[PDB]
Design a protein around this ligand. Sequence first.
Ligand code: E64
Length: 212
Amino acid sequence: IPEYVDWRQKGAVTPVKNQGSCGSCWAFSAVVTIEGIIKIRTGNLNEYSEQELLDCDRRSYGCNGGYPWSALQLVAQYGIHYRNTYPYEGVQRYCRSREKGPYAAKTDGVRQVQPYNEGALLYSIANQPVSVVLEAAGKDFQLYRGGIFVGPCGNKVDHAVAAVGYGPNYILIKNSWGTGWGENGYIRIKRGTGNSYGVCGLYTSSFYPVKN
Ligand SMILES: *[C@@H](C(=O)O)[C@H](O)C(=O)N[C@@H](CC(C)C)C(=O)NCCCCNC(N)=[NH2+]
């Protein structure tokens, strides 16, 4: 795998979104990985519906949090609508998948990256954007403005985001806090520190969709 990966330069990443006050990060992270795998496999970059996962993922808890893996498994079992068809409202509502016509895209499954393994996560990023989790509660992460982030942070992961690239000393992360946070909505998190958890627990729980 190459020294640098940046799925933004390969046209596989849509604009940065803002989840608002709703605890929907798990759905945004999952959606980032779906947009990426659909672009990689079909050549077209589309925006898909975070709201659909918020409403319809019966295993997750709407705005009270959820699981990127349940969201990816929902997209693999049923499918997902375009963001236009099922726009983001920032609040959990009734599942409206049947009333919005056929799904726009569908995947074939979900694979987990081997946790606590930097190379395994890098390998999965070299193939596609990956859903990852991290500890975002610390002021230092919340206030991140730019540069390669080294912390301080613990490993008590609480926030799902998406890894869309990496470099020799960092992993490139798409957050869902709007374009005004970090590096136009992105953060570069130091890697290669030898801590098995990853900086901010970045290697705790990583999933990506599979689409043949
Ligand atoms: C993330 C966010 O929107 O910032 C959101 O709070 C979230 O999904 N958190 C996850 C943490 C994982 C690392 C993704 C979470 O807490 N998931 C489990 C959901 C269960 C909590 N809620 C209820 N009602 N039981």
